[PDB]
């Protein structure tokens, strides 16, 4: 309806991007200042966060260029985990520095083309700032610890943070020689204390059945199955619905009853002590299992039931296509214990001892949910740090070192590409200035000092925003991985260049 | 009432065209800057090409409405240069306005544009070759492949997508005349793999129906039994339950399904073929039984989907189960089942070496955004080689051809004078807008870069030496590797001129206030 | 209830006319200056003559409505010169408008419009040259040079002679009208633009490809044509429906029973005699199965107008039922040939028994070449057709109008008082039409008009302005040859239209 | 930039201060009652701080923290609901000053928790232990707190009864925490304050059953949360009517169903059943109820969702929401179940003696007129809340507003010795404290700034000296007239206040 010409498009685009960059610059890092989430279009209730990711989803935006920022933020959450807020801020910064170039006389392509060459130079610099760590078991422990503690604070939860950091690093530590998460279950569950938390060495289903059914098995034999009882997974032993009579309502209820029982028999014929079902277990087959000697767990999860099947050494039935013809799993012990004020089922003696479950114990629901997410972003990080066991010196130490790399390049160059190099270095450097405000210690002194170190060549002083001074980094509790950072640099740039390149914004609203 | 009369009406038109023109101008060449369309649901899309962007765009004026039609013809034959016709058409008017202010009528210039188009084409024909063969057009097609990929979905050559793209078009050309359409070739995309997972399909690809990932998957023969009749009892695209009123009739209904599996399996076998395409379906249990019995069905085939296979094979679909003979079925040169997606179920490829009238190149994609861009490159590729088959010529285009023609048309203004003089002057600068705005979007000054190439037009003619179109320090078009078809650039010249001829026609600037509703 | 009266009221009515006269100002050739007229129904509209669009306008004056009505009168008779009538009437009134202020309000005006109109018609008819079709020419070669007149204007190079001799052949054979309706010209994509084809009969532009379209026959030597304004497809007769289930055979039975009804429809007409089935409504995918297998030809998705030409020429007739109908609702040809030309499949029906359509088939293979050829061939067919009916031919170009304006200048001297003034306005008004030809050719219009009067005072020849060459010269010796009769009609209609408006100056309106 | 949060935050502070101003003149026993106009056009007369904020607040983000802040206060102490708002707004006055100066918000938020941690030290040294297993010590501390509360007229009689409930739920020396998750407030029509009593088991509301037995000893506590009839049709019953025949066909199903359920309950062994409403359970049959009572099982029908969750923890009679889950484990052990129709008209079920985890006491509070019953309900609440606060935190501190000056003065001096950029934050925070005893003195009637200057000087020299005294209106020792507050009641006011001020400063 409206055709926004290249300049006019630039301003809307810039202002879109920037409005978003303020919110996430404040949320940033462990001392970062909170956001207030406001539910729009429906009520006006509030929640307080410090997570940059949540700002975007909860509170949307109608600016076309700002929508690109939202798409980008999604990608960090899953694949990398942490860095959802860290990216969004740098991308807005890159555009800010872009503003002065479009004005001067300088076309958008000039700025793009020279930031691509600059991204390649920054990456080379990310490798240099990346020193290997956590090759040996002792160092490997120390290595997971630093990254994981970073993540939680930046996405909210900083009170009970340390207890969860011990369990999370131990969990990844067991795996050894693979970055699985396909055995490390994450269970968030009501009951327990906020201080206590538990890692069972095995696998743990938090689903229970009371003390009215068996729960004590020694030398357990596992059948993993998806068996309907009312859902009615195939291997029917009931009837079709037909209507021929006014008493026919009675006939249906009975026919379901023979169905439930004939399926109990087929399960029974495996020769097992522990039966797990993703689906419902009706009141009638439940009692028939408790009598047979077989444990009943109903309402198992789609993630956990499958994931259980691998570790224990079973195999799933897959919609009850295997009624006696699927191989078992085995565990040494099945004990019911009370951890918190809950009853849990504890699989122990699991075949692949890689498997662990991390059980989060809330006593405020607001904490328990936010904690699950922030800890999941952290475990995404952890498992990539298996593939390459190295860290970079975080804190603003890397950002300056990429900025500087690109400043020395910038100097060499006098062409069209050279222009944007000046812009690119400034953009990277503008991130510690944000970290400096978050500290609450004036930016100009710190960032200038930091700058000085890295020219001479040093990555053994960084910014401590936890002391408000320029300090050592020697793999402390405030470094960042290489894993998170490579992806964060790549995406910020990539997003900004797509925003630059779109200047033929036709809005038909 | 309100009335924009004569001159006033003409001024209005000029304002519409230059705004449309400029959006297109900053999208010229692979140094182009992308288009983002936001709709009325706020759904964001990234596209490129003149033709597509206009079509989505709600027309706000008269010249805007005219351009959409114009663009779509450029898109069908040529498949590139869609944005470049538009830039030229609006540009030429932006100069006509300047002529108007001097005191020349739009009438005088508009006749001399038609003449100035005629002289531009003439000059074009001298530029580059006009003789190739189809095992030697391939090196320009590789030059077309660099630019076309590397401004859309990727910023790089991908040799796999390009080479798949060019074969498909050749399969249809040798069946009739050395001519192909844009309805005999298609890019069908289905998400599951990555953009580099691709196939060359020589006929068509249909989803192959499998009830479960424990049922057998076989293929055999080289021939397709195209049916609408059953290959196992129907269930013809509507809900059904079971309407038995005894236990007895349920038990009865299962054995009757067993016999019909066998009997259809044999009837098809006997004629030849054993993979069936049936328009109708049947529930999940009956299908599972037939897959176990072996000799795979395809069940739940669209009403369009069957028409697609038939047109490509050239044969017919039986209306009945009675009437079956090998003649009455369509003819394939191979049927083989290929893994669609990279973690998804197998599909059925029906390649044909018998007859071809629909050759699909099967592209896989991840997201909805990345597939739509990737197919955008494909469409443009199908079209440039369509021009070659019919008559084999290429031109160096990107800036090279336009400027060389421009200098030529300029020179004749001063050989001729009279009526066409002003028209020639304006036409020669219009042609030069095309390399110019390409440098505007790109990293380097528009005036400076235009001046550079113009120097080498006096020093040498018929140049492989245009402006940068890989964003380089050097400027060529042999080392920037942009090639257009000679006919393709030729078709632009016609089209731009055209727009001017259409606005001239009547004198009905009278409006009741209805003129863009 | 409204009433308005006065000398300023008269002035109103004329002012309205100017507004419609501007809409149609120039359209004589292909130059002027247009604005696309898009309606509120969401349709984009242009035409090849500007009087068409003008008909659609609804004028809120009754006086302005008269000038609309005479447009409709001209268009129906000649089919040309419709524009011309608006211009003369309006312009006459324009130079009269300031004369009304001065004193030319009296009804005497009507009398003067009659003297000027009656003389002028007679002068055309006498000066015009009466030429046989067998004088010293073939009938086709007289009309060759007249058909060229439209063809030279736009914008078709040297193929113009060749096309001209071709376009004639269709018109002579049919002749009995002055309209192009029973001829037409059909564009075809692809093929040679260095020759075109004259087909006696009808043809179809495109029939869509269906499943076993090449498994259907393309040639017949006694095609018997079924004209169907119906369709059979999946949505015209169903092939999906609910059934009871208690056996597999129930499912088979329902699809089976439906396929029978659709098979009945082609069979019943095939047994009458049909083997060619022509339909303008769609034919589907299920539909085309039966045909492909029978080895009986089918066609769907052919234009509604084209199907109606097929009726006249082959002697077929419309149906609305295809079951159990005679064989006297069928037409025949002697030749059915299907040749795919360009991207589109082309059906040719020729060998037609009474041949009440013949039509030129123009092959170019573009959109650019073909619309300008079609535009010129539309007006070609108008000049040649009307040359059979009135065999008096005069110079066009507005050359003869410049002579009338001379002639009437003379007359104004012996004709008295208030009438003289009226005559001087008639004379000035005749020069407007050629002024626009000067605007189209690219000249200074006022400079030019004066040079043609000089050779209408130094010989009385045929000097006028050419758009058919874009120069100034004799138009008779340039073969710009069009009948006397277009000019006879346009004068008399322009006076008639005029007299009504200047007479009304008291308008009573009711918005009831 | 952070300019636009700067501008938003000041606007939020100003709105929060304005709402908080009304409550400074409602503070303490000498508080000024507030006539509050609802969006409903009704005047509400209150002197309790918390409900003023709740009943109507402005639509700004700091205003909302205030409702939340006092809501948190209620669960934690139950006391200092009024005072907790006072310190919050007073701190936000201090913050504007810091901001302008160029002390960043991050600094003021960590310094404000650091100053709480530093404040609690100074407080404790002043505090003085009392016994938590002795009845008399807890009563004196509770009695002093009651004179200060709004309600006091019948609180003399309710105070020894408030301790008695709490003493039974204290069994070790640690004295647990004592929540209201073990002390149950039940009301009964009719009776006096002297008739009120502490029932060992739980007292349950209503009592539906006149065909049942009326006294059964050695009873088994059974819990129903399953139906007594086949599911809804259109009524809670399966039975519905639209034809004579239609009712018959449903009755065939229902009849079978009601006998197997009533019988199943009896076979497991129960003599008390706890049944909910006919809008909280999808079916119940009058027919099934007549039989269920006539088997000689004591029934209460009709009770709340809140009640059912309460019982399940306290007397260990765990959920039974299905037939399958009546097993022995779920059942309680009651010593007696009894109907009482004395000491207030109407019939309630008393279970006296119950096998229980923890220990659960219930006080049936009672009174002659409807308004007498409500005054005593307020009175036990006030009385119990202070006891629970002291058993959590053994030491005892003074009231009267003197501790509040005494912390401040120390916190100023210490801050200067320590120094730092955060010095300004901890010094201004201490001065934030000086507002509340000053605001209190004005309500007692004496020129306020002059009162708080003088008490500072008495604290500086002597320490434990003068405080705001209700007799004098002014400056006289609170050592001669004991005004005590539990240590948790003051810890709560400060730590909650800081947290709220922390969120607002952090909020963009």
Swiss-Prot record, chain A:
It comes from the Eukaryota. ATP binds at residues 29, 83-85, 480, 485. GO terms for cellular component: azurophil granule lumen; cell body; chaperonin-containing T-complex; cytosol; extracellular exosome; extracellular region; microtubule; zona pellucida receptor complex. ADP binds at residues 29, 83-86, 153-154, 395, 480, 485. It holds the Pfam family Cpn60_TCP1. Mg(2+) binds at residue 82. The modification Phosphoserine is found at residues 45, 245. Its EC number is 3.6.1.-. The modification Phosphothreonine is found at residue 246. There is a cross-link at residue 233 (Glycyl lysine isopeptide (Lys-Gly) (interchain with G-Cter in SUMO2)). GO terms for molecular function: ATP binding; ATP hydrolysis activity; ATP-dependent protein folding chaperone; protein folding chaperone; ubiquitin protein ligase binding; unfolded protein binding. Component of the chaperonin-containing T-complex (TRiC), a hexadecamer composed of two identical back-to-back stacked rings enclosing a protein folding chamber. Each ring is made up of eight different subunits: TCP1/CCT1, CCT2, CCT3, CCT4, CCT5, CCT6A/CCT6, CCT7, CCT8. Interacts with PACRG. Interacts with FLCN. Interacts with DLEC1. Interacts with SVEP1. Belongs to the TCP-1 chaperonin family. This is T-complex protein 1 subunit beta. It comes from Homo sapiens (Human). The lineage of its organism: Eukaryota, Metazoa, Chordata, Craniata, Vertebrata.
Swiss-Prot record, chain B:
Coiled coil: none annotated. The modification Phosphoserine is found at residues 2, 322, 515. There is a cross-link at residues 186, 190, 241, 251, 255, 368 (Glycyl lysine isopeptide (Lys-Gly) (interchain with G-Cter in SUMO2)). Pfam families: Cpn60_TCP1 (PF00118). Its EC number is 3.6.1.-. ADP binds at residues 29, 81-83, 151, 398, 468, 484, 489. GO terms for biological process: binding of sperm to zona pellucida; chaperone mediated protein folding independent of cofactor; chaperone-mediated protein folding; positive regulation of protein localization to Cajal body; positive regulation of telomerase RNA localization to Cajal body; positive regulation of telomere maintenance via telomerase; protein folding; protein stabilization. SUPFAM superfamilies: GroEL apical domain-like, GroEL equatorial domain-like, GroEL-intermediate domain like. ATP binds at residues 29, 82-83, 398. The keyword NAD does not apply. It is found in: Cytoplasm; Cytoplasm, Cytoskeleton, Microtubule organizing center, Centrosome. It catalyses: ATP + H2O = ADP + phosphate + H(+). GO terms for molecular function: ATP binding; ATP hydrolysis activity; ATP-dependent protein folding chaperone; beta-tubulin binding; G-protein beta-subunit binding; mRNA 3'-UTR binding; mRNA 5'-UTR binding; protein folding chaperone. Ubiquitinated by the DCX(DCAF12) complex specifically recognizes the diglutamate (Glu-Glu) at the C-terminus, leading to its degradation. Mg(2+) binds at residue 80. Its main location: cytoplasm. The keyword Acetylation applies. GO terms for cellular component: cell body; centrosome; chaperonin-containing T-complex; cytosol; extracellular exosome; microtubule. Induction: Down-regulated in response to enterovirus 71 (EV71) infection (at protein level). Belongs to the TCP-1 chaperonin family.
Curated annotation (Swiss-Prot), chain C:
Component of the chaperonin-containing T-complex (TRiC), a hexadecamer composed of two identical back-to-back stacked rings enclosing a protein folding chamber. Each ring is made up of eight different subunits: TCP1/CCT1, CCT2, CCT3, CCT4, CCT5, CCT6A/CCT6, CCT7, CCT8. Interacts with PACRG. Interacts with DLEC1. Belongs to the TCP-1 chaperonin family. It is an enzyme of class 3 (hydrolase). This is T-complex protein 1 subunit eta. InterPro entries: Chap_CCT_eta, Chaperone_TCP-1, Chaperonin_TCP-1_CS, Cpn60/GroEL/TCP-1, GroEL-like_apical_dom_sf, GROEL-like_equatorial_sf, TCP-1-like_intermed_sf, TCP-1_chaperonin. The modification N6-acetyllysine is found at residues 55, 238, 308. Mg(2+) binds at residue 80. It comes from Homo sapiens. GO terms for cellular component: cell body; chaperonin-containing T-complex; cytoplasm; cytosol; extracellular exosome; microtubule. It catalyses: ATP + H2O = ADP + phosphate + H(+). The gene is CCT7. Its EC number is 3.6.1.-. It holds the Pfam family Cpn60_TCP1. Its main location: cytoplasm. Keywords: Acetylation, ATP-binding, Chaperone, Cytoplasm, Hydrolase, Isopeptide bond, Methylation, Nucleotide-binding, Ubl conjugation. It is found in: Cytoplasm. ADP binds at residues 29, 81-84, 152-153, 397, 482, 487. It comes from the Eukaryota. ATP binds at residues 29, 81, 84, 386, 397, 487. There is a cross-link at residue 418 (Glycyl lysine isopeptide (Lys-Gly) (interchain with G-Cter in SUMO2)). Gene3D superfamilies: GroEL (3.50.7.10), GroEL-like equatorial domain (1.10.560.10), TCP-1-like chaperonin intermediate domain (3.30.260.10). One of its GO terms (molecular function) is ATP binding.
UniProtKB/Swiss-Prot annotation, chain D:
The modification N6-acetyllysine is found at residues 263, 277, 294, 301. ATP binds at residues 28, 80-81, 149. The modification Phosphoserine is found at residues 11, 159, 177, 419. One of its GO terms (molecular function) is protein folding chaperone. One of its GO terms (cellular component) is centrosome. Mg(2+) binds at residue 79. It catalyses: ATP + H2O = ADP + phosphate + H(+). Pfam families: Cpn60_TCP1 (PF00118). Disulfide bonds: none annotated. ADP binds at residues 28, 80-83, 147-149, 400, 485. It comes from the Eukaryota. The keyword Signal does not apply. Keywords: Acetylation, ATP-binding, Cell projection, Chaperone, Cytoplasm, Cytoskeleton, Hydrolase, Methylation, Nucleotide-binding, Phosphoprotein. Gene3D superfamilies: GroEL (3.50.7.10), GroEL-like equatorial domain (1.10.560.10), TCP-1-like chaperonin intermediate domain (3.30.260.10). The keyword Transport does not apply. InterPro entries: Chap_CCT_delta, Chaperone_TCP-1, Chaperonin_TCP-1_CS, Cpn60/GroEL/TCP-1, GroEL-like_apical_dom_sf, GROEL-like_equatorial_sf, TCP-1-like_intermed_sf, TCP-1_chaperonin. Belongs to the TCP-1 chaperonin family. It is linked to De novo genetic variants in nearly every subunit of the TRiC complex, including CCT4, have been found in individuals with a broad spectrum of brain malformations, and clinical phenotypes ranging from mild to severe epilepsy, developmental delay, intellectual disability, ataxia, and other features of cerebral malfunction. This is T-complex protein 1 subunit delta. It comes from Homo sapiens. The lineage of its organism: Eukaryota, Metazoa, Chordata, Craniata, Vertebrata. The gene is CCT4.
């Amino acid at each position: 309806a409206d055709e926004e010409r290249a300049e006019t498009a630039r301003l809307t685009s810039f202002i879109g991007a920037i409005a978003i960059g303020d919110l996430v610059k404040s949320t940033l890092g462990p001392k970062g200042m909170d956001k207030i989430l406001l539910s729009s279009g429906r009520d006006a209730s509030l929640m307080v966060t410090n997570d940059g990711a949540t700002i975007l989803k909860n509170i949307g935006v109608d600016n076309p260029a700002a929508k690109v920022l939202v798409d980008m933020s999604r990608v960090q959450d899953d694949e990398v985990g942490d860095g959802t807020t860290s990216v969004t801020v740098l991308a807005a910064e890159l555009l800010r520095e872009a503003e002065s170039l479009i004005a001067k006389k300088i076309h958008p392509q000039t700025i793009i083309a020279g930031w691509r060459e600059a991204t390649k130079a920054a990456r080379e610099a990310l490798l240099s700032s990346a020193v290997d760590h956590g090759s040996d078991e002792v160092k490997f422990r120390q290595d997971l610890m630093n990254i994981a503690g970073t993540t939680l604070s930046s996405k909210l939860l900083t009170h009970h943070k340390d207890h969860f950091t011990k369990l999370a690093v131990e969990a990844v530590l067991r795996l050894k020689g693979s970055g699985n998460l396909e055995a490390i279950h994450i269970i968030k569950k009501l009951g327990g204390s906020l201080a206590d938390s538990y890692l069972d060495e095995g696998f743990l289903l938090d689903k229970k059945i009371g003390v009215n059914q068996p729960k004590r098995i020694e030398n357990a034999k596992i059948l993993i199955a998806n068996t309907g009882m009312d859902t009615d997974k195939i291997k029917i032993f009931g009837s079709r619905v037909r209507v021929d009579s006014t008493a026919k309502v009675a006939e249906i209820e009975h026919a379901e009853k023979e169905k439930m029982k004939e399926k109990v028999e087929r399960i029974l014929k495996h020769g097992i002590n522990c039966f797990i079902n993703r689906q419902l277990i009706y009141n009638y087959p439940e009692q028939l299992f408790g009598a047979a000697g077989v444990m009943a767990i109903e309402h198992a999860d789609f993630a956990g039931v499958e994931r259980l099947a691998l570790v224990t050494g079973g195999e799933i039935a897959s919609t009850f296509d295997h009624p006696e013809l699927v191989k078992l799993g085995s565990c040494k012990l099945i004990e019911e214990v009370m951890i918190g004020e809950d009853k849990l089922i504890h699989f122990s003696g699991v075949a692949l001892g890689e498997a662990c479950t991390i059980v989060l114990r809330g006593a405020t629901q607001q904490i328990l949910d936010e904690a699950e997410r922030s800890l999941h972003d952290a475990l995404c990080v952890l498992a990539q740090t298996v593939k390459d066991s190295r860290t970079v010196y975080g804190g603003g130490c890397s950002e300056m070192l990429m900025a500087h790399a690109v400043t020395q390049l910038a100097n060499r160059t006098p062409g069209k590409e050279a222009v944007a190099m000046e812009s690119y270095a400034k953009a990277l450097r503008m991130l510690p200035t944000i970290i400096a405000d978050n500290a609450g210690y004036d930016s100009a002194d710190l960032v200038a000092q930091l700058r000085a170190a890295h020219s001479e060549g040093n990555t053994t002083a960084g910014l401590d925003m936890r002391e408000g001074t320029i300090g050592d980094m020697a793999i402390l509790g405030i470094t960042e991985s290489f894993q998170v950072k490579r992806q964060v640099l790549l995406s910020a740039a990539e997003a900004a260049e797509v925003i630059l390149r779109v200047d033929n914004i036709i809005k038909a609203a | 009432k309100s009335r924009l009369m004569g001159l006033e009406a003409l001024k209005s038109h000029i304002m519409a065209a230059k705004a449309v023109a400029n959006t297109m101008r900053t999208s010229l060449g692979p140094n182009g800057l992308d288009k983002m369309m936001v709709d009325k649901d706020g759904d964001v899309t990234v596209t490129n090409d003149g033709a597509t962007i206009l079509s989505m765009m709600d027309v706000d004026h008269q010249i805007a409405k005219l351009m959409v039609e114009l663009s779509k013809s450029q898109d069908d034959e040529i498949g590139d240069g869609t944005t470049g016709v538009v830039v030229l058409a609006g540009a030429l008017l932006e100069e006509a306005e300047q002529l108007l202010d001097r005191g020349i009528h739009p009438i005088r210039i508009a006749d001399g544009y038609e003449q100035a188009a005629r002289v531009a084409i003439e000059h074009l024909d001298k530029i580059s070759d006009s003789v190739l063969v189809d095992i030697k057009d391939t090196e320009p097609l590789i030059q077309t492949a660099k630019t076309t990929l590397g401004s859309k979905v990727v910023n790089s050559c991908h040799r796999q997508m390009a080479e798949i793209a060019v074969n498909a078009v050749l399969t249809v050309a040798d069946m009739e005349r050395r001519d192909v359409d844009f309805e005999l070739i298609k890019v069908e995309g289905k998400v599951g793999g990555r953009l580099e997972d691709t196939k060359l399909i020589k006929g068509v690809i249909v989803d192959k129906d499998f009830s479960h990932p424990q049922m057998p998957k076989k293929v055999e023969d080289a021939k397709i039994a195209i049916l609408t009749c059953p290959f196992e009892p129907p269930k013809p695209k509507t809900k059904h339950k079971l309407d038995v009123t005894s236990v007895e009739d349920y038990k009865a209904l299962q054995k009757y399904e067993k016999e019909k599996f066998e009997e259809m399996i044999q009837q098809i076998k006997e004629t030849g073929a054993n993979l069936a395409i049936c328009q109708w379906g049947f529930d999940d249990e009956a299908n599972h039984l037939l897959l176990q019995n072996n000799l795979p069905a395809v069940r739940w085939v669209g009403g369009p989907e069957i028409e697609l296979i038939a047109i490509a094979t050239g044969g017919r679909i039986v209306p009945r189960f009675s009437e079956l003979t090998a003649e009455k079925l369509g003819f394939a040169g191979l049927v083989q089942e290929i893994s669609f997606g990279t973690t998804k179920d197998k599909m059925l490829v029906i390649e044909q070496c018998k007859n071809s009238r629909a050759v699909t190149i099967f592209i896989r994609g991840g997201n909805k955004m990345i597939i739509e861009e990737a197919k955008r490159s494909l469409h443009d590729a199908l079209c440039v080689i369509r021009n070659l088959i019919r008559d084999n010529r290429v031109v160096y285009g990107g800036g090279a051809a336009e400027i060389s023609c421009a200098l030529a048309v300029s020179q004749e203004a001063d050989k001729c004078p009279t009526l066409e003089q002003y028209a020639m002057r304006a036409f020669a600068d219009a042609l030069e807008v095309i390399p110019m705005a390409l440098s505007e979007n790109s990293g380097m000054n528009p005036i400076q870069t235009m001046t550079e190439v113009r120097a080498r037009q006096v020093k040498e003619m018929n140049p492989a030496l245009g402006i940068d179109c890989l964003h380089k320090g050097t400027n060529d078009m042999k080392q920037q590797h942009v090639i257009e078809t000679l006919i393709g650039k030729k078709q632009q010249i016609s089209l731009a001129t055209q727009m001017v001829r259409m606005i001239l026609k009547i004198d009905d600037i009278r409006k009741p206030g209805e003129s863009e509703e | 209830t409204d009433s308005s009266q006065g000398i300023p009221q008269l002035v109103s009515n004329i002012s309205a006319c100017q507004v419609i006269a501007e809409a149609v100002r120039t359209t004589l050739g292909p130059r002027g200056m247009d604005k696309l007229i898009v309606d509120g129904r969401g349709k984009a509209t242009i035409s090849n003559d500007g009087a068409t669009i003008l008909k659609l306008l609804d004028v809120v004056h009754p006086a302005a409505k008269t000038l609309v009505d005479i447009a409709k009168s001209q268009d129906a008779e000649v089919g040309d010169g419709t524009t011309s009538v608006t211009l003369l009437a309006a312009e006459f009134l324009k130079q009269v408008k300031p004369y009304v202020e001065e004193g030319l309000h009296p009804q005497i005006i009507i009398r003067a419009f009659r003297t000027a109109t009656q003389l002028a018609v007679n002068k055309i008819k006498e000066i015009a040259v009466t030429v046989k079709k067998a004088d010293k020419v073939e009938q086709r070669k007289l009309l060759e040079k007249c058909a060229m007149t439209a063809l030279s204007s736009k914008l078709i190079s040297q193929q113009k002679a060749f096309f001209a001799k071709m376009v004639v052949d269709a018109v002579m054979m049919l002749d009995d009208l002055l309209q192009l309706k029973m001829i037409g010209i059909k564009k075809v994509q692809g093929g040679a633009l260095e020759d075109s084809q004259l087909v006696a009969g009808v043809a179809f532009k495109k029939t869509f490809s269906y499943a076993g379209f090449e498994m259907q026959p393309k040639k017949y030597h006694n095609p018997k044509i079924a004209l169907l304004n119906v369709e059979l497809e999946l949505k015209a007769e169903k092939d999906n429906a609910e059934i009871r289930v208690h056996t597999v055979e129930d499912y088979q039975a329902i699809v089976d029973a439906e396929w029978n009804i659709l098979y009945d429809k082609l069979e019943k007409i095939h047994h009458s005699g049909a083997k060619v089935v022509l339909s303008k409504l769609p034919i589907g995918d299920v539909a085309t199965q039966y045909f492909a297998d029978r080895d009986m030809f089918c066609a769907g998705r052919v234009p509604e107008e084209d199907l109606k030409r097929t009726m006249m020429a082959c002697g077929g007739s419309i149906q609305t039922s295809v079951n159990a109908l005679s064989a006297d609702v069928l037409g025949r040809c002697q030749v059915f040939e299907e040749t795919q030309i360009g991207g589109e499949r082309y059906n040719f029906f020729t060998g037609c028994p009474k041949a009440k359509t013949c039509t030129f088939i123009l092959r170019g293979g573009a959109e650019q070449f073909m619309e300008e050829t079609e535009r010129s061939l539309h007006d070609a067919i108008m000049i040649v057709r009307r040359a059979i009916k009135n065999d008096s031919v005069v110079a066009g170009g507005g050359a003869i109008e410049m002579e009338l304006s001379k002639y009437l200048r003379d007359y104004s001297r012996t004709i008295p008082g208030k009438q003289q003034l009226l005559i001087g306005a008639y004379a000035k008004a005749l020069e407007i039409i050629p002024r626009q030809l000067c605007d189209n050719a690219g000249f200074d219009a006022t400079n030019i008009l004066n040079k043609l009067r000089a050779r209408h005072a130094q010989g009385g020849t045929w000097y006028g302005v050419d758009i058919n060459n874009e120069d100034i010269a004799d138009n008779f010796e340039a073969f710009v040859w069009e009948p006397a009769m277009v000019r006879i009609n346009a004068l008399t209609a322009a006076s008639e239209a005029a007299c009504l408006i200047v007479s009304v100056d008291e308008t009573i309106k009711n918005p009831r | 930039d952070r300019d636009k949060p700067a501008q938003i935050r000041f606007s939020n502070i100003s709105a929060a201060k304005a709402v908080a101003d009304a409550i400074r003149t409602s503070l303490g026993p000498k508080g000024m009652d507030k006539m509050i106009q609802d969006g409903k056009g009704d005047v509400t007369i209150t002197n309790d701080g918390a409900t003023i904020l709740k009943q109507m607040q402005v639509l700004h983000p700091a205003a909302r923290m205030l409702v939340e802040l006092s809501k948190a206060q209620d669960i934690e102490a139950g006391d200092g609901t009024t005072s907790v708002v006072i310190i919050a707004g007073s701190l936000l006055d201090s913050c504007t000053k810091l901001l302008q100066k160029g002390i960043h918000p991050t600094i003021i938020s960590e310094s404000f928790q650091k100053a709480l941690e530093k404040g609690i030290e100074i407080l404790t040294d002043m505090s003085r232990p009392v016994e938590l297993s002795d009845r008399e010590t807890l009563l004196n501390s509770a009695t002093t707190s009651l004179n200060s509360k709004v309600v006091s007229q019948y609180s003399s009689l309710l105070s020894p009864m408030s301790v008695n409930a709490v003493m039974k739920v204290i069994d070790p020396a640690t004295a647990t925490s004592v929540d209201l998750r073990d002390i149950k407030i039940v009301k009964k029509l009719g009776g006096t304050i002297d008739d009120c009593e502490l029932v060992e088991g739980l007292v349950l509301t209503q009592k539906v059953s006149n065909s049942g037995i009326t006294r059964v000893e050695k009873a088994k506590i059974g819990l129903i949360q399953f139906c007594l009839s086949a599911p809804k049709t259109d009524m809670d019953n399966q039975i519905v009517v639209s034809d004579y025949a239609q009712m018959d066909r449903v009755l065939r199903e229902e009849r079978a169903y009601i006998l197997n359920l009533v019988k199943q309950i009896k076979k497991t062994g129960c003599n008390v059943l706890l049944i909910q409403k006919s809008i909280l359970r999808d079916a119940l049959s009058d027919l099934a109820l007549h039989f269920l009572n006539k088997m000689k099982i004591m029934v209460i029908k009709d009770i709340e969702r809140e009640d059912i969750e309460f019982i399940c923890k306290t007397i260990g009679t765990k959920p039974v929401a299905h037939i399958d889950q009546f097993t022995a484990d779920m059942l309680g052990s009651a010593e007696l179940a009894e109907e009482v129709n004395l000491n207030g008209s109407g019939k309630l079920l008393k279970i006296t003696g119950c096998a229980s985890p923890g220990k659960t006491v219930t006080i049936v509070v009672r009174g002659s007129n409807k308004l007498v019953i409500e005054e005593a309900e307020r009175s036990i609440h006030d009385a119990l809340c202070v006891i629970r606060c002291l058993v959590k935190k053994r030491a005892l501190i003074a009231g009267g507003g003197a501790p509040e000056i005494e912390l401040a003065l120390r916190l100023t001096e210490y801050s200067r010795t320590l120094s730092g950029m955060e010095s300004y934050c901890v010094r201004a925070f201490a001065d934030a404290m000086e507002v509340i005893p000053s605001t209190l003195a004005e309500n007692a009637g004496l020129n306020p700034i002059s009162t708080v200057t003088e008490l500072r000087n008495r604290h500086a020299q002597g320490e434990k000296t003068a405080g705001i005294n209700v007799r004098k209106g002014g400056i006289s020792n609170i050592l001669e007239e004991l005004v005590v507050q539990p240590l948790l009641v003051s810890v709560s006011a400060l730590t909650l206040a800081t947290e709220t001020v922390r969120s607002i400063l952090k909020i963009d």
